[PDB]
């Protein structure tokens, strides 16, 4: 008859318990200590300006109404019980669509200590908003947040605090990173207050700092475009009497350049403003176009001013590579110092 | 035992949540508010836009007034199913959802005199038919309508509060191609098979940003048409050179023409972008056909073809410049 004690303890625990009222309704401002363990920093979708994150959200607080005395010090409770006591109604301010996992059973735990302290852990995937400034794409670093707090309880009723020093209260698993196009440099945590028409509310924020990887864009956009420009310029070392060769060469180079530009922009999401990749694309495309038109001028001035035709061929030969080299130096320096 | 517990237990005693306050006396008057967290992406393909709001409603329920020393009850989402709640719905929403993590995101506050405040967080995929003429130089202002589902004008009347609909930053919003310009709110009565209903509207003025489209479509197309112009300045005996140049410009133009409309629904009218791209393609076509005709006539009327070469040199750039001028002035005017 050693289980009757626990069943009676649990049955009495809720006797005369009102879960519409926060703990410490007439004594305190309820104080919830929060901790987040990021099991995996999910993928970041720059198309949707969002990122996914899977966390073990641990919230603790005190409930004098649930003090108990018995053989056990810490008491395990089930979802049917946790649904009958008051729990903080935390929500994610920038959350889009979060799922609480319930297979094979709800992924929640509720522990009570003899002194009335509760620990409520929940495993849940959060899809949160990641407002992205893609001006320096593909060299852009983002710091987009995870902000949570209470709905319906102002700072005069419920206040959140980090259970440990703030920097150590958000912990990312070593193998958590599920990112393939970004790199997680670290995070910063903070607290704050948000003013609404219904009062002031406590906000707990965490910024995860990301840095985009460049190797893919280099090896699949930048090098093909640079080499197409190089070809367009290679046109100049041929002879002027090879008119069909020069014309087909230039026109097919422009065709390849349009193909590359279409592919690159189709890769990037549809943002209506200019990114570093767009600047590179446009400048290289301008170089190809200018080489073709310069050849046209050389061909025109042939048969009528051969001296000037040769002079301009030599001048273009000398100048265009210098302009392209200077542009590359300036562009890469200005976008890598940042 | 506790004071507030007794107040709540007394309030809920003898309460029928199936009957609106004043079910047979006068219409329930509900004041409404909105705090727009964000306006998500506007996809013209499906003719919808996402919006995230905090939606608040206030009304008087004479059965919810108490006489304690406490002035206001501050509550969770636990009592929302216990008291009567208006059945407000969004008339033009393809799909909407409330938020449930970690706890239902509702709020309830009952005042001493029976006044009730109810707030919930919503995400709405509102529908609006975008007149896609002048695209990409198009402006839109499309609504969010809501009303009661079952209570006609004689039971429920909605009314906007002084400063009801408010927007937040507008800097972090996910409006890719558009730019929030302003909002307006309206009231109307709409007749239905069920009855007359007070319909409340909020309008959001969205202006497209050329940006993406202008760069990708307009500049490459213009330079491709200029390629045929430069072709004009080569020679008459350079037959393979001119023919290859014209055909490859045609191929490049055809490649370009497809991605212009990949950001558009399958609308069966002509947009500004489509007109521009088609005109450019016709310009390239006409340049190559002109060279073909000149090469044919080189054996018939050399004296006439000599005039024709320079005549084309003159006309083609001038015609394209006039087309640009008229096109841009007319569309930017609209």
């Amino acid at each position: 008859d050693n289980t009757t004690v626990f069943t009676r303890i649990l049955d009495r625990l809720l006797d005369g318990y009102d879960n519409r009222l926060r703990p410490g309704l007439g004594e305190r401002v309820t104080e919830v200590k929060t901790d987040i363990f990021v099991t995996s920093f999910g993928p970041v979708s720059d198309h949707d300006m969002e990122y996914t994150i899977d966390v073990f959200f641990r919230q603790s607080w005190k409930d004098e109404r649930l003090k108990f005395k018995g053989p056990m010090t810490v008491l395990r409770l089930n979802n049917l019980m946790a649904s009958k006591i008051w729990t903080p109604d935390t929500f994610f301010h920038n959350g889009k669509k979060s799922v609480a996992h319930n297979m094979t059973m709800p992924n929640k735990l509720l522990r009570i200590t003899e002194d009335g302290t509760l620990l409520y852990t929940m495993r849940l995937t959060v899809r949160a908003e990641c407002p992205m400034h893609l001006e320096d794409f593909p060299m852009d670093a983002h710091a987009c947040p995870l902000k949570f707090g209470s709905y319906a309880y102002t700072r005069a009723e419920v206040v959140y605090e980090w259970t440990r020093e703030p920097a150590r209260s958000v912990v990312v698993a070593e193998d958590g990173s599920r990112l393939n196009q970004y790199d997680l440099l670290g995070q910063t945590v903070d607290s704050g207050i948000v003013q609404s028409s219904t009062g002031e509310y406590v906000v707990m924020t965490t910024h995860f700092h990301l840095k985009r990887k460049i190797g893919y864009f280099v090896i699949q956009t930048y090098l093909p475009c640079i080499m197409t420009v190089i070809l367009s310029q290679v046109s100049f070392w041929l002879n002027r009497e090879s008119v069909p060769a020069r014309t087909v060469f230039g026109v097919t180079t422009v065709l390849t350049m349009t193909t590359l530009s279409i592919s690159a922009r189709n890769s990037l999401p549809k943002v209506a403003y200019a990114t570093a990749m767009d600047w590179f694309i446009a400048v290289c495309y301008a170089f190809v176009f200018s080489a073709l038109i310069e050849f046209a001028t050389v061909n025109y001035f042939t048969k009528s001013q051969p001296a000037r035709a040769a002079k301009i061929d030599r001048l273009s030969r000398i100048a265009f590579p210098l302009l392209f080299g200077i542009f590359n130096l300036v562009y890469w320096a200005t976008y890598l110092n940042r | 035992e506790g004071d507030v517990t007794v107040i709540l237990n007394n309030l809920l005693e003898g309460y029928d949540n199936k009957l609106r306050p004043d079910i047979g006396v006068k219409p329930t008057l509900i004041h409404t508010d909105m705090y727009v967290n964000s306006i998500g992406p506007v996809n013209a393909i499906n003719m919808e836009y996402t919006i995230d709001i905090f939606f608040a409603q206030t009304w008087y329920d004479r059965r919810l007034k108490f006489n304690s020393t406490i002035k206001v009850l501050r509550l969770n989402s636990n009592m929302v199913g216990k008291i009567w709640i208006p059945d407000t719905f969004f008339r033009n929403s393809k799909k909407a959802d409330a938020h449930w993590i970690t706890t239902p995101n509702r709020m309830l506050r009952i005042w001493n005199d029976g006044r009730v405040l109810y707030t919930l967080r919503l995400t709405i995929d509102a529908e609006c038919q975008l007149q896609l003429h002048n695209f990409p130089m198009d402006e839109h202002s499309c609504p969010l309508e809501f009303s009661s589902y079952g209570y006609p004008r004689e039971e429920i009347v909605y009314q906007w509060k002084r400063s009801s609909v408010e927007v937040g930053d507008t800097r972090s919003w996910r409006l890719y191609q558009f730019s929030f310009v302003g909002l307006r709110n309206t009231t109307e009565v709409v007749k239905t098979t069920s009855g007359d209903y007070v319909v409340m509207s909020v309008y959001f003025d969205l202006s497209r940003r050329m940006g993406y489209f202008t760069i990708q479509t307009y500049i490459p197309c213009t330079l491709i048409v200029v390629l045929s112009w430069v072709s004009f300045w080569i020679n008459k005996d350079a037959v393979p050179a001119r023919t290859s140049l014209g055909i490859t410009t045609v191929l490049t133009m055809t490649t370009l023409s497809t991605i212009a409309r990949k950001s558009l629904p399958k609308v069966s009218y002509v947009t500004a972008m489509d007109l521009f791209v088609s005109v450019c393609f016709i310009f390239v076509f006409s340049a190559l056909v002109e060279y073909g005709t000149l090469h044919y006539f080189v054996s018939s009327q050399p004296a006439r073809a000599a005039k024709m070469d320079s005549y084309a040199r003159i006309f083609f750039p001038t015609a394209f410049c006039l087309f640009n001028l008229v096109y841009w002035v007319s569309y930017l005017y609209l």
Partner: T-cell receptor
Amino acid sequence: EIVLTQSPATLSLSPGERATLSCRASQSVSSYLAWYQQKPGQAPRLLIYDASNRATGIPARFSGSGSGTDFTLTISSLEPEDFAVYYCQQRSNWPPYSFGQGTKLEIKR
Amino acid sequence: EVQLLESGEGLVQPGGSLRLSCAASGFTFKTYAMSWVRQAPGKGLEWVSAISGSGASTYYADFVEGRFTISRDNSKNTLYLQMNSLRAEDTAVYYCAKEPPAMVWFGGGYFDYWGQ
């Protein structure tokens, strides 16, 4: 922490005029600001609570407004007995309760 | 009808002790949070300590480093303040003030009534 500052430190006015007392807080105290009147030789009396609501039995000439960090108390048609010291009190987290230094409202002759 | 009556007046030598009591009548004593406010001679009002309406929770100002202790008895309808390790800076008129009940903080933020 929260520090309430009342300006002016004194306010010299004559009966029948319109007075304005300002209490400015270092950080936001939301709507939790109250105004008290202490006629010398007596205990304080509540005038305005929650920054806008008049207490029970207060003549309608006492009005208050504000929110956040800037609050104001306005007396219209100063009666002779409305000359006293006025305090602003705030309810917050870091200091539970706190009073302003007080504003002494005297007669102008 | 409401009546708060402070008592315990008396001289004290520095480092001494004193027990102020405030007898309340005319209202339900166990529903209101009560507080102690002191005014030094020629100075402004200053809040000393507050006790919940059930006596469970107590709050003290910064200047009282664990020296005072507030208490109440709902059976006697009385509010107490035991003072210890006093100082000459502690001279003042001490008021008991009652705070209305509310679901925010541990009562409305203000004092609805004051003692003499």
